Amino acid sequence: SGKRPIVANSIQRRGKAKREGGVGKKTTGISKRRQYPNLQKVRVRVAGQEITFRVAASHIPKVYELVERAKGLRLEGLSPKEIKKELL
RNA sequence: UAGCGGGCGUGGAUCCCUGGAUGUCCGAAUGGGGGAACCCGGCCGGCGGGAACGCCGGUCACCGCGCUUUUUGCGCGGGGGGAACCUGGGGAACUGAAACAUCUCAGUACCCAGAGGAGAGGAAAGAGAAAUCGACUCCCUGAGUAGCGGCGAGCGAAAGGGGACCAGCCUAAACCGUCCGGCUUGUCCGGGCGGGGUCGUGGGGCCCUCGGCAACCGAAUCCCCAGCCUAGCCGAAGCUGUUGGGAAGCAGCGCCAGAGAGGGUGAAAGCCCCGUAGGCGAAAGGUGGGGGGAUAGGUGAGGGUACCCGAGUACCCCGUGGUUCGUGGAGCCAUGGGGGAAUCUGGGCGGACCACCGCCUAAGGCUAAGUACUCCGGGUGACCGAUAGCGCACCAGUACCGUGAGGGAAA
RNA sequence: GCCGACCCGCGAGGGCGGCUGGAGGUAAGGGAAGUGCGAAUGCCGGCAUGAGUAACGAUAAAGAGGGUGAGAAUCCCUCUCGCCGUAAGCCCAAGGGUUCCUACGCAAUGGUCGUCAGCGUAGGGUUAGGCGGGACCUAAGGUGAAGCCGAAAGGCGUAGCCGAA
RNA sequence: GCCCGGCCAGAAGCGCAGGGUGGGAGGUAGGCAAAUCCGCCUCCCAAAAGCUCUGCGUGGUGGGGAAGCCCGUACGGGUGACAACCCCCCGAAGCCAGGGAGCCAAGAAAAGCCUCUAAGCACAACCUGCGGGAACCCGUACCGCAAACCGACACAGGUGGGCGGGUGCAAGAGCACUCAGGCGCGCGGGAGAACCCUCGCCAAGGAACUCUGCAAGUUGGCCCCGUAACUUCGGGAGAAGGGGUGCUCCCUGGGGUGAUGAGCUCCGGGGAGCCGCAGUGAACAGGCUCUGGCGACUGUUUACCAAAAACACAGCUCUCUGCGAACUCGUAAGAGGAGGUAUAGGGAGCGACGCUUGCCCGGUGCCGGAAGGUCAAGGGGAGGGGUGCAAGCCCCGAACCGAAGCCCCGGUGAACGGCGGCCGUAACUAUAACGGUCCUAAGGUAGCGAAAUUCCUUGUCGGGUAAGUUCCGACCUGCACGAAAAGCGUAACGACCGGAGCGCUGUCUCGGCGAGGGACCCGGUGAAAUUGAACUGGCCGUGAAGAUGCGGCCUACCCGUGGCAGGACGAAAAGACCCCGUGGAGCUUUACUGCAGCCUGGUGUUGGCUCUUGGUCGCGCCUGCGUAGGAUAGGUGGGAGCCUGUGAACCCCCGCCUCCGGGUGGGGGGGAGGCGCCGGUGAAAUACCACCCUGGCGCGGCUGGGGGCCUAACCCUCGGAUGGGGGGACAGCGCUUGGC
RNA sequence: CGCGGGGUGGAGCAGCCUGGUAGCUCGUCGGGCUCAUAACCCGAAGGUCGUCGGUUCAAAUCCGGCCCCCGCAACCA
Ligand SMILES: [Mg+2]
Ligand SMILES: [Mg+2]
Ligand SMILES: [Mg+2]
Ligand SMILES: [Mg+2]
Ligand SMILES: [Mg+2]
Ligand SMILES: [Mg+2]
Ligand SMILES: [Mg+2]
Ligand SMILES: [Mg+2]
Ligand SMILES: [Mg+2]
Ligand SMILES: [Mg+2]
Ligand SMILES: [Mg+2]
Ligand SMILES: [Mg+2]
Ligand SMILES: [Mg+2]
Ligand SMILES: [Mg+2]
Ligand SMILES: [Mg+2]
Ligand SMILES: [Mg+2]
Ligand SMILES: [Mg+2]
Ligand SMILES: [Mg+2]
Ligand SMILES: [Mg+2]
Ligand SMILES: [Mg+2]
Ligand SMILES: [Mg+2]
Ligand SMILES: [Mg+2]
Ligand SMILES: [Mg+2]
Ligand SMILES: [Mg+2]
Ligand SMILES: [Mg+2]
Ligand SMILES: [Mg+2]
Ligand SMILES: [Mg+2]
Ligand SMILES: [Mg+2]
Ligand SMILES: [Mg+2]
Ligand SMILES: [Mg+2]
Ligand SMILES: [Mg+2]
Ligand SMILES: [Mg+2]
Ligand SMILES: [Mg+2]
Ligand SMILES: [Mg+2]
Ligand SMILES: [Mg+2]
Ligand SMILES: [Mg+2]
Ligand SMILES: [Mg+2]
Ligand SMILES: [Mg+2]
Ligand SMILES: [Mg+2]
Ligand SMILES: [Mg+2]
Ligand SMILES: [Mg+2]
Ligand SMILES: [Mg+2]
Ligand SMILES: [Mg+2]
Ligand SMILES: [Mg+2]
Ligand SMILES: [Mg+2]
Ligand SMILES: [Mg+2]
Ligand SMILES: [Mg+2]
Ligand SMILES: [Mg+2]
Ligand SMILES: [Mg+2]
Ligand SMILES: [Mg+2]
Ligand SMILES: [Mg+2]
Ligand SMILES: [Mg+2]
Ligand SMILES: [Mg+2]
Ligand SMILES: [Mg+2]
Ligand SMILES: [Mg+2]
Ligand SMILES: [Mg+2]
Ligand SMILES: [Mg+2]
Ligand SMILES: [Mg+2]
Ligand SMILES: [Mg+2]
Ligand SMILES: [Mg+2]
Ligand SMILES: [Mg+2]
Ligand SMILES: [Mg+2]
Ligand SMILES: [Mg+2]
Ligand SMILES: [Mg+2]
Ligand SMILES: [Mg+2]
Ligand SMILES: [Mg+2]
Ligand SMILES: [Mg+2]
Ligand SMILES: [Mg+2]
Ligand SMILES: [Mg+2]
Ligand SMILES: [Mg+2]
Ligand SMILES: [Mg+2]
Ligand SMILES: [Mg+2]
Ligand SMILES: [Mg+2]
Ligand SMILES: [Mg+2]
Ligand SMILES: [Mg+2]
Ligand SMILES: [Mg+2]
Ligand SMILES: [Mg+2]
Ligand SMILES: [Mg+2]
Ligand SMILES: [Mg+2]
Ligand SMILES: [Mg+2]
Ligand SMILES: [Mg+2]
Ligand SMILES: [Mg+2]
Ligand SMILES: [Mg+2]
Ligand SMILES: [Mg+2]
Ligand SMILES: [Mg+2]
Ligand SMILES: [Mg+2]
Ligand SMILES: [Mg+2]
Ligand SMILES: [Mg+2]
Ligand SMILES: [Mg+2]
Ligand SMILES: [Mg+2]
Ligand SMILES: [Mg+2]
Ligand SMILES: [Mg+2]
Ligand SMILES: [Mg+2]
Ligand SMILES: [Mg+2]
Ligand SMILES: [Mg+2]
Ligand SMILES: [Mg+2]
Ligand SMILES: [Mg+2]
Ligand SMILES: [Mg+2]
Ligand SMILES: [Mg+2]
Ligand SMILES: [Mg+2]
Ligand SMILES: [Mg+2]
Ligand SMILES: [Mg+2]
Ligand SMILES: [Mg+2]
Ligand SMILES: [Mg+2]
Ligand SMILES: [Mg+2]
Ligand SMILES: [Mg+2]
Ligand SMILES: [Mg+2]
Ligand SMILES: [Mg+2]
Ligand SMILES: [Mg+2]
Ligand SMILES: [Mg+2]
Ligand SMILES: [Mg+2]
Ligand SMILES: [Mg+2]
Ligand SMILES: [Mg+2]
Ligand SMILES: [Mg+2]
Ligand SMILES: [Mg+2]
Ligand SMILES: [Mg+2]
Ligand SMILES: [Mg+2]
Ligand SMILES: [Mg+2]
Ligand SMILES: [Mg+2]
Ligand SMILES: [Mg+2]
Ligand SMILES: [Mg+2]
Ligand SMILES: [Mg+2]
Ligand SMILES: [Mg+2]
Ligand SMILES: [Mg+2]
Ligand SMILES: [Mg+2]
Ligand SMILES: [Mg+2]
Ligand SMILES: [Mg+2]
Ligand SMILES: [Mg+2]
Ligand SMILES: [Mg+2]
Ligand SMILES: [Mg+2]
Ligand SMILES: [Mg+2]
Ligand SMILES: [Mg+2]
Ligand SMILES: [Mg+2]
Ligand SMILES: [Mg+2]
Ligand SMILES: [Mg+2]
Ligand SMILES: [Mg+2]
Ligand SMILES: [Mg+2]
Ligand SMILES: [Mg+2]
Ligand SMILES: [Mg+2]
Ligand SMILES: [Mg+2]
Ligand SMILES: [Mg+2]
Ligand SMILES: [Mg+2]
Ligand SMILES: [Mg+2]
Ligand SMILES: [Mg+2]
Ligand SMILES: [Mg+2]
Ligand SMILES: [Mg+2]
Ligand SMILES: [Mg+2]
Ligand SMILES: [Mg+2]
Ligand SMILES: [Mg+2]
Ligand SMILES: [Mg+2]
Ligand SMILES: [Mg+2]
Ligand SMILES: [Mg+2]
Ligand SMILES: [Mg+2]
Ligand SMILES: [Mg+2]
Ligand SMILES: [Mg+2]
Ligand SMILES: [Mg+2]
Ligand SMILES: [Mg+2]
Ligand SMILES: [Mg+2]
Ligand SMILES: [Mg+2]
Ligand SMILES: [Mg+2]
Ligand SMILES: [Mg+2]
Ligand SMILES: [Mg+2]
Ligand SMILES: [Mg+2]
Ligand SMILES: [Mg+2]
Ligand SMILES: [Mg+2]
Ligand SMILES: [Mg+2]
Ligand SMILES: [Mg+2]
Ligand SMILES: [Mg+2]
Ligand SMILES: [Mg+2]
Ligand SMILES: [Mg+2]
Ligand SMILES: [Mg+2]
Ligand SMILES: [Mg+2]
Ligand SMILES: [Mg+2]
Ligand SMILES: [Mg+2]
Ligand SMILES: [Mg+2]
Ligand SMILES: [Mg+2]
Ligand SMILES: [Mg+2]
Ligand SMILES: [Mg+2]
Ligand SMILES: [Mg+2]
Ligand SMILES: [Mg+2]
Ligand SMILES: [Mg+2]
Ligand SMILES: [Mg+2]
Ligand SMILES: [Mg+2]
Ligand SMILES: [Mg+2]
Ligand SMILES: [Mg+2]
Ligand SMILES: [Mg+2]
Ligand SMILES: [Mg+2]
Ligand SMILES: [Mg+2]
Ligand SMILES: [Mg+2]
Ligand SMILES: [Mg+2]
Ligand SMILES: [Mg+2]
Ligand SMILES: [Mg+2]
Ligand SMILES: [Mg+2]
Ligand SMILES: [Mg+2]
Ligand SMILES: [Mg+2]
Ligand SMILES: [Mg+2]
Ligand SMILES: [Mg+2]
Ligand SMILES: [Mg+2]
Ligand SMILES: [Mg+2]
Ligand SMILES: [Mg+2]
Ligand SMILES: [Mg+2]
Ligand SMILES: [Mg+2]
Ligand SMILES: [Mg+2]
Ligand SMILES: [Mg+2]
Ligand SMILES: [Mg+2]
Ligand SMILES: [Mg+2]
Ligand SMILES: [Mg+2]
Ligand SMILES: [Mg+2]
Ligand SMILES: [Mg+2]
Ligand SMILES: [Mg+2]
Ligand SMILES: [Mg+2]
Ligand SMILES: [Mg+2]
Ligand SMILES: [Mg+2]
Ligand SMILES: [Mg+2]
Ligand SMILES: [Mg+2]
Ligand SMILES: [Mg+2]
Ligand SMILES: [Mg+2]
Ligand SMILES: [Mg+2]
Ligand SMILES: [Mg+2]
Ligand SMILES: [Mg+2]
Ligand SMILES: [Mg+2]
Ligand SMILES: [Mg+2]
Ligand SMILES: [Mg+2]
Ligand SMILES: [Mg+2]
Ligand SMILES: [Mg+2]
Ligand SMILES: [Mg+2]
Ligand SMILES: [Mg+2]
Ligand SMILES: [Mg+2]
Ligand SMILES: [Mg+2]
Ligand SMILES: [Mg+2]
Ligand SMILES: [Mg+2]
Ligand SMILES: [Mg+2]
Ligand SMILES: [Mg+2]
Ligand SMILES: [Mg+2]
Ligand SMILES: [Mg+2]
Ligand SMILES: [Mg+2]
Ligand SMILES: [Mg+2]
Ligand SMILES: [Mg+2]
Ligand SMILES: [Mg+2]
Ligand SMILES: [Mg+2]
Ligand SMILES: [Mg+2]
Ligand SMILES: [Mg+2]
Ligand SMILES: [Mg+2]
Ligand SMILES: [Mg+2]
Ligand SMILES: [Mg+2]
Ligand SMILES: [Mg+2]
Ligand SMILES: [Mg+2]
Ligand SMILES: [Mg+2]
Ligand SMILES: [Mg+2]
Ligand SMILES: [Mg+2]
Ligand SMILES: [Mg+2]
Ligand SMILES: [Mg+2]
Ligand SMILES: [Mg+2]
Ligand SMILES: [Mg+2]
Ligand SMILES: [Mg+2]
Ligand SMILES: [Mg+2]
Ligand SMILES: [Mg+2]
Ligand SMILES: [Mg+2]
Ligand SMILES: [Mg+2]
Ligand SMILES: [Mg+2]
Ligand SMILES: [Mg+2]
Ligand SMILES: [Mg+2]
Ligand SMILES: [Mg+2]
Ligand SMILES: [Mg+2]
Ligand SMILES: [Mg+2]
Ligand SMILES: [Mg+2]
Ligand SMILES: [Mg+2]
Ligand SMILES: [Mg+2]
Ligand SMILES: [Mg+2]
Ligand SMILES: [Mg+2]
Ligand SMILES: [Mg+2]
Ligand SMILES: [Mg+2]
Ligand SMILES: [Mg+2]
Ligand SMILES: [Mg+2]
Ligand SMILES: [Mg+2]
Ligand SMILES: [Mg+2]
Ligand SMILES: [Mg+2]
Ligand SMILES: [Mg+2]
Ligand SMILES: [Mg+2]
Ligand SMILES: [Mg+2]
Ligand SMILES: [Mg+2]
Ligand SMILES: [Mg+2]
Ligand SMILES: [Mg+2]
């Protein structure tokens, strides 16, 4: 999948194989395929309870930056789901 | 739709239009189950002697959002369908290349998600050579041009010009006030609300000097009206003879015409009937900027300081998509992976790259009109006339065939 | 539309006359096309040939009297004969869906006939606290809060729920 | 005497027959303890009854109740009884039912039910009994082995469970006949031709038939006698070959029920007779033997032409896999493997069992190999280029460092596979144990052999027959056997294929007669493929080369009915063969190109500590052994003097390198020199100093490799975890690089 | 096409490093020992160390061009 602040989905874009020179010519052989986002689990505490974020490495910090603003946010009550949701 | 058998209507029925009422059961189907149209319940209330049974009324699915002191709840919303049109996510092959693999068919068929009477796009980090144009969309042209291409098959733009339409806006950030939480009291750390602000003649913030504004703009938001729509109404002018089963034909004389469209009437009718020309009409519902009113908004000039101007973004590299561009000298737009800034002496672009000269302000969002379609209503055809025309003129998506998806007549 | 021995044209056709038909037709001159059929094992429909031919669906088998009736080898009744009898009898389940019973009826259906029928028309008929099933239980399996996964559609799946010969 | 019938249900109670069950006391650390229940430990008692549950019988009482006759469409109503309603016997696979024994392949769940306690409650609630009351929804016709369901149809097909009587036969659900009940299959009537179907019989012969004894026939059940090779000792065996079987009377043995018996009933043994052609008098009802091949065997298969020698099989070997297993499906989550753990699981081959399974590792595969060679991105950056006045920006790019793979070095055959050619020789002839030579990775071993393999071929010899392209036995010039695509054998088994013999036969010589169902005639109903049109003959020619249709000649009144099948190049299917098309599809591989998959370097996720080592830049300090000349002078240059005060020529102890001669640098000290000399002289020359090369060491910056430790990401796991344990910066996953 | 390292006696090869060494092995000849044959031992003949130029006192050794061979990688309208 892709979920989280990352935004990033999984783009399907083809890889095309070539034999050649480039300074004599260059020919081909092509087909479809998909690239994935570097998703990664990210644990973090925030208030009570743990909480996790299947997110790309490219936005891992954004999570900790996101927890920073959460501390200043008056929040509580058992709700791991609602935590994450309220965490924007 | 006649028959048996009974009724109603000028105290104005049937009928037409508008609004309301009732609407078993299934179906997004929503109390639960389920082999759709069936079965079984919780809670509150009612009925039957009514505890046991049964019926009746109300209520109870799930998800999102905002509250709610949390709990339990309350409120707003969603769900499914739609002929084609629209956007997006995925996305073939036959075929063409007279084989075939790049390429083609094609981002087509189709699958999926979503939107609406439209959808999309849209206020330049644009175009590209004029120191020029000034959102977007659609038509003509430019143009089969530029160019792409096993430079094969074949594909194929844009600027500009002629037209349709015409509209422009809101934010984020600095900065000020407030509330809540935090510490190590600071124009402080975070969060919510309001004020402030919104741009390329670069703008804004904060300071100093002048109106300390009446004014002038003004809606895409409201409200009133015209108008139109969903029933209707008025509407000119001909008689005699004659043949005929039947006059509208034939013969004589006559009239109307803003009406001599058409249909019907036993045959061929301007004047027989319904109409036609031209006029009139709504208690009720829908529509309504075309006109009018109102509000929401919105606006000046210098000087100073260097506070702010959208980040894993720009930018570079790797792998790709889009474009006329098939790796090509390959920019530009987009982005899966890696490295990774600055805030206007800042950044992007004008086809590698560098200098010069110019253009434009990315990383937030909204916007009517011109455009597409035809389930539905009307009008018209050098359109068919029952083997035609929709598959169906008719009791047809039926009969019948198939486990099913599905096929599908005749009349 | 049917007919002609007639007229005109080289011909494709045109015209005339007679009969049928019963409500439309469209000169000269021009315009536009779904415009001419004998063959496509063409398409649809009708009708022929084979032909009064093959066949009438198990070689378990018939006969007679009486009755009904427009009509009887075929319907009813009686007697005689034959056939099945781990069935060719009897009772459940599934599937079928009024074929059940009563009366009336023979156009069609019945491979002949038909007065008969599983056929036509009308009327009636299916009664449960104890049978079966549900207001009980679970199986495979299905579904599926929670959870996990997937471009979308969706896949996996705990509790629960559904599911019986 | 014949014929008809001589029962059904039933609460309590009673009785017969079974099912289930230990009782009491104490202790308790388990049943995610809450328990007085369960479990576990201990003691005592009876060890059986008691208790509980079911079946069967009985049981107040209720129900039913035949033949025959009269009336009768149907259908029953009476008669018809006041009906009788009892005894014995056989006896289930069903009941008592969770009965019993043995066996291995080890045989659902949940609720009801009972018990225990929690919350809670105890004015409740729960249990037993009694009274009064309450008890909804759906199905319910009819068909249902078939005319009502599935097959387009009143279709000779298909469709799961139960009852399914009597008699006879070894027994039975078999076969024959028959109850109850049901039916005579929805066209008939005649005829008694050919021909076809189904059936019976046949003189003499008896496989001569034929590809083949195809088919048919022979035999059949039960009892007794009797029975070979071979064998894995189970078999072969129903071997083979024979005898008996009916009825009658007499004598007689055993079991069951009852009572030890009468009767009933089951199983027999002995003797004497009787009749027929024939006694399991009809119907179920093996013909037999020898000998090869193949496959061990039961089993499986091409629904609709193949049932086999094919598949499978128990078993043998190879190989993968240490568990989050390998492998399989899935994009993933996951699932299978397996709730299994190397005596397990996956893949492959061979295919009971017996005796065996030889040589070749050169190529191919797979396995091992810290060297080396080649190699991608990436690192590096000598050097080069574009542009600008410039600081810069941009680009190209060598050396060197980079993984799998490939090369290379080995191993490996129950891994793919392979397992020779020529010439000569033994006082007959023939042959060749022996030899020569060429090539190979190695040259086919055992055993088998004109074979399910043998082309020549009907090889040759023997056997069998009168006669044998087949069959068996044997030779071996094996076109073209051969050892787990196993080799050679093997008892038993086979709707397997080959050869023979006995018995018996219409297979035949060789046909005949008879029966029924059709064909034929009459009445009723009434198709089909096919069809250019037809007024459709023979011969000999002719013609696209095979004429009813052309020519010549011959022949032939018109129309049919039953038959035959030579022609109409008959009907059917736009040839399945062949070719063609720059057709199609399935399959193969060291065809091409790709994709999945897997391997792999870099990098993100990715962190802490420490040791070691390399590249490179910089700074410091060092090593450098040819003449003469005075040196045994790393390269070069200035340079007369100058340097030793940053204190001279120069004396003892330590570190390091080594060409063993010495260089050089650390701890205390001496005292003013060192070298130079055009002389001398070498390519160029000696003070000191400076830069520089060859390699080394120390310090620092950028940067790469390797080892160990750690934990906190990440993965696994643990009766909740904010956590403990395990792995661990690996793995997994994103992007990218090469390879298979 | 670029990159990498080779040529030395009759044959194979060290020495190249970093300058003062041409060696080894078999082969050929003589001799020693021997049934024979090798083994062993002694001695010996034989190389501008590819070519032409270059630095050097002195190289095959360091340098430049080139001849030829071997190998590496790439391309092939
Ligand atoms: Mg993903
Ligand atoms: Mg991203
Ligand atoms: Mg994309
Ligand atoms: Mg690629
Ligand atoms: Mg290619
Ligand atoms: Mg993490
Ligand atoms: Mg964690
Ligand atoms: Mg990061
Ligand atoms: Mg990053
Ligand atoms: Mg970030
Ligand atoms: Mg809470
Ligand atoms: Mg909330
Ligand atoms: Mg009416
Ligand atoms: Mg009145
Ligand atoms: Mg009225
Ligand atoms: Mg109502
Ligand atoms: Mg609701
Ligand atoms: Mg239902
Ligand atoms: Mg009452
Ligand atoms: Mg009540
Ligand atoms: Mg109700
Ligand atoms: Mg949701
Ligand atoms: Mg609010
Ligand atoms: Mg609350
Ligand atoms: Mg709370
Ligand atoms: Mg609402
Ligand atoms: Mg519609
Ligand atoms: Mg084309
Ligand atoms: Mg073509
Ligand atoms: Mg082709
Ligand atoms: Mg395209
Ligand atoms: Mg598109
Ligand atoms: Mg959606
Ligand atoms: Mg919508
Ligand atoms: Mg709208
Ligand atoms: Mg658009
Ligand atoms: Mg210019
Ligand atoms: Mg312009
Ligand atoms: Mg502008
Ligand atoms: Mg546009
Ligand atoms: Mg348009
Ligand atoms: Mg236009
Ligand atoms: Mg060209
Ligand atoms: Mg071409
Ligand atoms: Mg327009
Ligand atoms: Mg217009
Ligand atoms: Mg607080
Ligand atoms: Mg803050
Ligand atoms: Mg406006
Ligand atoms: Mg109206
Ligand atoms: Mg008027
Ligand atoms: Mg008058
Ligand atoms: Mg008139
Ligand atoms: Mg007239
Ligand atoms: Mg007229
Ligand atoms: Mg007219
Ligand atoms: Mg008219
Ligand atoms: Mg008007
Ligand atoms: Mg009106
Ligand atoms: Mg009103
Ligand atoms: Mg309306
Ligand atoms: Mg309207
Ligand atoms: Mg107005
Ligand atoms: Mg105002
Ligand atoms: Mg930032
Ligand atoms: Mg920022
Ligand atoms: Mg971003
Ligand atoms: Mg790359
Ligand atoms: Mg190209
Ligand atoms: Mg392209
Ligand atoms: Mg090009
Ligand atoms: Mg550029
Ligand atoms: Mg990116
Ligand atoms: Mg900057
Ligand atoms: Mg850009
Ligand atoms: Mg530009
Ligand atoms: Mg470039
Ligand atoms: Mg621009
Ligand atoms: Mg933003
Ligand atoms: Mg019609
Ligand atoms: Mg239609
Ligand atoms: Mg049609
Ligand atoms: Mg219609
Ligand atoms: Mg209807
Ligand atoms: Mg209709
Ligand atoms: Mg049709
Ligand atoms: Mg005439
Ligand atoms: Mg005439
Ligand atoms: Mg003419
Ligand atoms: Mg006309
Ligand atoms: Mg014309
Ligand atoms: Mg046409
Ligand atoms: Mg034709
Ligand atoms: Mg028709
Ligand atoms: Mg018709
Ligand atoms: Mg006809
Ligand atoms: Mg006929
Ligand atoms: Mg006849
Ligand atoms: Mg018939
Ligand atoms: Mg028939
Ligand atoms: Mg009579
Ligand atoms: Mg009559
Ligand atoms: Mg009959
Ligand atoms: Mg049976
Ligand atoms: Mg039925
Ligand atoms: Mg039915
Ligand atoms: Mg009839
Ligand atoms: Mg009839
Ligand atoms: Mg009929
Ligand atoms: Mg029939
Ligand atoms: Mg009759
Ligand atoms: Mg009658
Ligand atoms: Mg009735
Ligand atoms: Mg049942
Ligand atoms: Mg109830
Ligand atoms: Mg996608
Ligand atoms: Mg799961
Ligand atoms: Mg799960
Ligand atoms: Mg009797
Ligand atoms: Mg214990
Ligand atoms: Mg417990
Ligand atoms: Mg305890
Ligand atoms: Mg107790
Ligand atoms: Mg005791
Ligand atoms: Mg007792
Ligand atoms: Mg007792
Ligand atoms: Mg009981
Ligand atoms: Mg009786
Ligand atoms: Mg009587
Ligand atoms: Mg009578
Ligand atoms: Mg009676
Ligand atoms: Mg009596
Ligand atoms: Mg007695
Ligand atoms: Mg038994
Ligand atoms: Mg039992
Ligand atoms: Mg038991
Ligand atoms: Mg068990
Ligand atoms: Mg108990
Ligand atoms: Mg209490
Ligand atoms: Mg009841
Ligand atoms: Mg109920
Ligand atoms: Mg129901
Ligand atoms: Mg019933
Ligand atoms: Mg049957
Ligand atoms: Mg059957
Ligand atoms: Mg039936
Ligand atoms: Mg039926
Ligand atoms: Mg029948
Ligand atoms: Mg059949
Ligand atoms: Mg069936
Ligand atoms: Mg069944
Ligand atoms: Mg009986
Ligand atoms: Mg028997
Ligand atoms: Mg028997
Ligand atoms: Mg017996
Ligand atoms: Mg018997
Ligand atoms: Mg039968
Ligand atoms: Mg007759
Ligand atoms: Mg006869
Ligand atoms: Mg006869
Ligand atoms: Mg027979
Ligand atoms: Mg006989
Ligand atoms: Mg004989
Ligand atoms: Mg023969
Ligand atoms: Mg045969
Ligand atoms: Mg034969
Ligand atoms: Mg025989
Ligand atoms: Mg014997
Ligand atoms: Mg013997
Ligand atoms: Mg034994
Ligand atoms: Mg035997
Ligand atoms: Mg004997
Ligand atoms: Mg007898
Ligand atoms: Mg005895
Ligand atoms: Mg017997
Ligand atoms: Mg017999
Ligand atoms: Mg037998
Ligand atoms: Mg037999
Ligand atoms: Mg015999
Ligand atoms: Mg014998
Ligand atoms: Mg054989
Ligand atoms: Mg065997
Ligand atoms: Mg076997
Ligand atoms: Mg067996
Ligand atoms: Mg068997
Ligand atoms: Mg088949
Ligand atoms: Mg056959
Ligand atoms: Mg068989
Ligand atoms: Mg076989
Ligand atoms: Mg098979
Ligand atoms: Mg074995
Ligand atoms: Mg393996
Ligand atoms: Mg593991
Ligand atoms: Mg584990
Ligand atoms: Mg398991
Ligand atoms: Mg196992
Ligand atoms: Mg051997
Ligand atoms: Mg050997
Ligand atoms: Mg090998
Ligand atoms: Mg080897
Ligand atoms: Mg292999
Ligand atoms: Mg190496
Ligand atoms: Mg350089
Ligand atoms: Mg240069
Ligand atoms: Mg730059
Ligand atoms: Mg590496
Ligand atoms: Mg190689
Ligand atoms: Mg093997
Ligand atoms: Mg080989
Ligand atoms: Mg053999
Ligand atoms: Mg032989
Ligand atoms: Mg032979
Ligand atoms: Mg064989
Ligand atoms: Mg054979
Ligand atoms: Mg052979
Ligand atoms: Mg030959
Ligand atoms: Mg041959
Ligand atoms: Mg032969
Ligand atoms: Mg032969
Ligand atoms: Mg012979
Ligand atoms: Mg002989
Ligand atoms: Mg031999
Ligand atoms: Mg020979
Ligand atoms: Mg052979
Ligand atoms: Mg052999
Ligand atoms: Mg045996
Ligand atoms: Mg067999
Ligand atoms: Mg004999
Ligand atoms: Mg004869
Ligand atoms: Mg006979
Ligand atoms: Mg006859
Ligand atoms: Mg002749
Ligand atoms: Mg001719
Ligand atoms: Mg001929
Ligand atoms: Mg002629
Ligand atoms: Mg003739
Ligand atoms: Mg005749
Ligand atoms: Mg013939
Ligand atoms: Mg052939
Ligand atoms: Mg052809
Ligand atoms: Mg052709
Ligand atoms: Mg070709
Ligand atoms: Mg061609
Ligand atoms: Mg083709
Ligand atoms: Mg290959
Ligand atoms: Mg290969
Ligand atoms: Mg592919
Ligand atoms: Mg180092
Ligand atoms: Mg010298
Ligand atoms: Mg010297
Ligand atoms: Mg000298
Ligand atoms: Mg010396
Ligand atoms: Mg020295
Ligand atoms: Mg020196
Ligand atoms: Mg001294
Ligand atoms: Mg010391
Ligand atoms: Mg010394
Ligand atoms: Mg010293
Ligand atoms: Mg000292
Ligand atoms: Mg002293
Ligand atoms: Mg001293
Ligand atoms: Mg000199
Ligand atoms: Mg000096
Ligand atoms: Mg100096
Ligand atoms: Mg130098
Ligand atoms: Mg350092
Ligand atoms: Mg655990
Ligand atoms: Mg925590
Ligand atoms: Mg992951
Ligand atoms: Mg391989
Ligand atoms: Mg390989
Ligand atoms: Mg090149
Ligand atoms: Mg070249
Ligand atoms: Mg070259
Ligand atoms: Mg190299
Ligand atoms: Mg020599
Ligand atoms: Mg020798
Ligand atoms: Mg020389
Ligand atoms: Mg020399
Ligand atoms: Mg020379
Ligand atoms: Mg190389
Ligand atoms: Mg090249
Ligand atoms: Mg080449």
PDB file of C-alpha atoms (C1' of nucleotides) in Angstrom, chain D residues 381-385:
ATOM      1  C1'   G D 381      40.390  10.815  -9.972  1.00  0.00           C
ATOM      2  C1'   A D 382      45.749  11.152 -13.212  1.00  0.00           C
ATOM      3  C1'   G D 383      44.614  13.863 -17.382  1.00  0.00           C
ATOM      4  C1'   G D 384      41.406  16.484 -20.965  1.00  0.00           C
ATOM      5  C1'   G D 385      37.198  19.935 -22.744  1.00  0.00           C
TER       6        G D 385
END
